[PDB]
Paper text:
We first determined the structure of the putatively catalytically inactive OphP variant S580A. The eight monomers differ only in flexible loops some of which are involved in crystal contacts. All the monomers in the asymmetric unit adopt a “closed” conformation with the two domains packed against each other. Structure alignment between OphP and GmPOPB confirmed the putative catalytic triad with some deviations regarding the position of its histidine residue ([Fig fig4]). His701 of OphP sits in a flexible loop region (Leu697–Thr707) which is only resolved in two chains (chain A and chain H) where it adopts different conformations (**Figure S11**). Although chain A and H have different arrangements of this loop, in both His701 is around 15 Å away from Ser580 and a structural re-arrangement is required to form the canonical catalytic triad. Apo S580A crystallized in a closed conformation in the absence of ligand ([Fig fig4]).
OphP is an essential enzyme for the biosynthesis of the macrocyclic peptide natural product omphalotin A. The enzyme has been proposed to proteolytically release a peptide intermediate from the precursor protein OphMA and to macrocyclize the multiply α-N-methylated core of this intermediate to produce omphalotin A. Our *in vitro* experiments demonstrate that OphP does not process OphMA but shows robust macrocyclase activity on pre-processed α-N-methylated peptides. OphP tolerates sequence promiscuity in the substrate but has a preference for highly α-N-methylated substrates and for N-methylated glycine residue at the catalytic site. The promiscuity of OphP is explained by structural analysis of co-complexes which reveals a predominantly hydrophobic substrate binding cleft with few interactions between substrate side chains and OphP. Similar to other POPs, the monomer has two domains, an α/β hydrolase domain (residues 1–82, 453–738) and the seven-bladed β-propeller domain (residues 83–452) ([Fig fig4]).
Numbering used by the authors: 2 to 225, 231 to 730
The structure:
């Protein structure tokens, strides 16, 4: 039987294309890749162009034929038109800065208010204060993004990154803090900036010297799919051209290594850190900027033996530097180094918590050390004495979710942004005291037409295949019955010590309301939810544990009558695309709809493209014979089930035509192979393409809504759901 939506657009095959891999078990294994031509970028291949255009047109026709697509876009537009803001961030110009969106602006704007006048911002009258920077003015389409910013210590200068209009490359710009954007400036330019333009940057790590004369940054050779190579550290002096910038570090022997510098808050010490993979291990060196001219002739001293640990600067006290480090402490700890006694090594200030991952450490009110711990898949705030490390107790103990803390060592107050599945964003002020402090509600995000009291988030524990107890969040309307009829949207990642925290998404709650559905977040292995050991149990030869955890979550939801066996939708992005494609291959019968965002799918070829080589610490090295065998077992691109005795779920793949973070070739080849293997469906396999590269880290509000309307209408069609 031939479905009315077919046939699929044709995709050229290369029947001769193969690579031979060393294998511990088999000696050698020859892997055919009939779609290897789709590894050539869109801009360089007419074949890749023809594939993208035909697949894009085919997907759009199917998605747009569904009237629920426009119904979802209208519902999303109306509900997403709510005011959003960050916590107040104190800066060296004596102003608080905050992110603001009226509702449907493409990008967040940056506003400011004099410290002491903050009670006049974020009222019914509007954001108040003064507009500082409006990213919406940068591009005609609103796809140009602020990638970061750092104010000069003097408070006169503001260094900031803007993503270039084709790519995930950026330029660093500088403007005076006396040159804000004006509300009536025209789109397509950046008015009021200084002449400085730092090109060839792929990540924003900028550190000003204490004299405010310049900043350190990391850059690459000029850009005229290939692995990212030859990261260099430079120093830029304000008012000079980039051509005058002084080279601080290059390592031509190790072109895949990523390098950056961080300065202590005093600006006295510079920490050089190199990374050779995605693991939390560095090659680290410290220099005293008072001993050295900026250049390649600086007196670098070894902080510790290379590749054993990561070191993040938390503060300084003369020659004493405070570090958050995992040195002999996989869950991280706080330790001090005396730059005057390097050979004495690191002294523990806050011991590793064996049962809690330390996320951050920051100094406040001169000598209060604030620790954010991850315990039971949510944030805890602990206060410690900076001098002794002695515990001073807990704050916000009653709030279960995630926190963003803003405030400096010199401020007695912090602003804390609290959020969860059910809390869109409450900014609390906390004022430090002698024995206890005082907490005040500053401002709360409210969403018109959403009643947060209509929803709940349950915490359950389920056994995985191997008997391991896994935590899962289940968000649902309180009035949805547990009678085994509800649809599920189940989101997972599983990797890189990244926790799936309670996180606010209006879209997800609208999915729950409109489809009487549950939103399930199983805290599967690979994440840091139960400490670094939770990551170690879900990587390399144990990556299969991640898929088993996710499958067992679905089986538990069905068995305990949370969900209909026929209405499971799964969702994942990047490393989460390994999860969605692997689970679809290994248990196609569990799932009715699979959403993959910028998926990693070819687990043999991933090292050959942009930043993929760094993922070898997580997945293994496919060119190592031992690693090949365990990677090849699950590599979703190489394990599409034979068509004869499998019905594939409906599958929708989101990707840009250009993406540095995950090369779109992963999606291109897997979509080609799925369509070839299952040419008659019965369930469609579609690729939803953005041609504007709408950056992950810089996506306009309107693009996000269109993508969500495509995703939800496709899930609705695929699982036979009616919008309520
Ligand atoms: Na823009």
């Amino acid at each position: 039987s031939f479905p009315g939506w077919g046939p699929y657009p044709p995709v050229e095959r290369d029947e001769t294309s193969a690579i031979t891999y060393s294998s511990k078990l088999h000696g050698s294994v020859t892997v055919r890749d009939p779609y290897s031509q789709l590894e050539v970028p869109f801009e360089d291949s007419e074949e890749t162009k023809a594939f993208v255009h035909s697949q894009r047109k085919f997907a759009r026709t199917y998605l747009d034929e569904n009237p629920d697509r426009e119904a979802w876009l209208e519902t999303l537009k109306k509900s997403w038109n709510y005011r959003r803001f960050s916590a107040l961030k104190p800066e060296s110009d004596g102003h608080y800065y905050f992110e603001y969106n009226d509702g449907l602006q493409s990008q967040l704007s940056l506003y400011r208010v004099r410290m002491g006048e903050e009670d006049t911002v974020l009222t019914e009258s509007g954001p108040g204060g003064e507009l500082f920077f409006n990213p919406n003015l940068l591009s005609l389409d609103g796809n140009a993004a602020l990638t970061g910013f750092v104010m000069s210590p003097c408070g006169n200068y503001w260094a900031y990154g803007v993503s270039e209009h084709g790519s995930d490359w950026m330029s660093i710009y500088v403007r005076k803090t006396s040159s804000p954007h004006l509300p009536s400036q025209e789109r397509g330019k950046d008015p009021g900036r200084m002449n400085d333009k730092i090109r060839h940057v792929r990540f924003f790590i900028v550190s000003w010297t204490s004299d405010s004369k310049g900043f350190f940054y990391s850059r690459y050779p000029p850009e005229d799919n290939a692995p990212a190579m030859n990261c260099m550290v430079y120093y830029h002096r304000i008012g000079e051209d980039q051509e005058s910038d002084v080279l601080v570090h290059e390592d031509p022997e190790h072109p895949f290594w990523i390098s950056s510098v961080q300065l202590t808050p005093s600006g006295r010490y510079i920490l050089f850190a190199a990374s050779r993979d995605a693991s939390h291990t560095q090659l680290v060196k410290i220099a005293d900027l008072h001993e050295n001219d900026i250049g390649t002739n600086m007196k670098w001293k070894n902080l510790h033996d290379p590749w054993e640990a990561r070191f993040t600067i938390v503060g300084d006290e003369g020659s004493k530097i405070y570090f958050m480090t995992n040195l002999k402490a996989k869950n991280y700890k706080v330790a001090t180094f005396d730059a005057n006694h390097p050979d004495e090594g690191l002294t523990t200030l806050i011991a590793e918590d064996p049962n809690a991952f330390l996320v951050s450490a920051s100094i406040h009110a001169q000598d209060k050390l604030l620790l954010v711990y991850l315990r039971n898949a949510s944030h805890e705030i602990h206060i410690r004495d900076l001098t002794t490390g002695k515990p001073l107790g807990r704050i916000f103990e009653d709030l279960l979710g995630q926190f963003m803390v803003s405030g400096r060592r010199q401020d007695n107050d912090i602003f804390v942004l609290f959020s969860s599945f059910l809390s869109p964003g409450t900014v609390y002020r906390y004022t430090f005291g002698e024995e206890k402090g005082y907490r005040s509600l500053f401002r709360a995000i409210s969403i018109p037409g959403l009643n947060l009291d209509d929803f709940m988030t349950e915490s359950v524990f389920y056994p995985s295949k191997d008997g391991t107890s896994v935590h899962m969040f289940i968000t649902r309307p309180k009035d949805v019955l547990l009678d085994g009829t509800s649809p599920v949207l189940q989101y997972g990642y599983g990797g890189f010590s990244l926790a799936m925290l309670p996180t606010f998404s209006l879209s997800t709650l609208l999915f729950c309301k409109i489809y009487r559905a549950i939103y399930a977040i199983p805290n599967i292995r690979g994440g840091s939810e139960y400490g670094e050991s939770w990551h170690r149990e879900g990587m390399l030869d144990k990556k299969q544990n991640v898929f088993d955890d996710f499958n067992a979550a679905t089986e538990w939801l069905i068995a305990n009558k949370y969900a209909s066996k026929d209405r499971i939708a799964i969702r994942g992005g990047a490393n989460g695309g390994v999860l969605t494609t692997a689970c679809a291959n290994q248990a196609p019968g569990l799932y009715r709809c699979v959403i993959t965002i910028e998926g990693i799918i070819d687990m043999l070829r991933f090292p050959k493209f942009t930043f993929g080589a760094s993922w070898r610490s997580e997945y293994g090295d496919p060119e190592d014979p031992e690693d090949f065998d365990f990677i090849f077992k699950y590599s979703p691109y190489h394990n599409i089930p034979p068509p004869g005795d499998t019905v594939m779920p409906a599958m929708l793949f989101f990707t840009a035509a250009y993406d540095d973070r995950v090369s779109p070739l992963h999606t291109f080849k897997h979509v080609a192979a799925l369509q070839h293997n299952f040419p008659k469906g019965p369930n469609p396999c579609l690729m939803r393409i953005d041609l504007n590269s709408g950056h992950f880290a810089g996506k306009s509000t309107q693009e996000m809504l269109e993508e969500t309307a495509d995703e939800y209408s496709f899930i609705g069609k695929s699982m036979g759901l009616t919008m309520q």
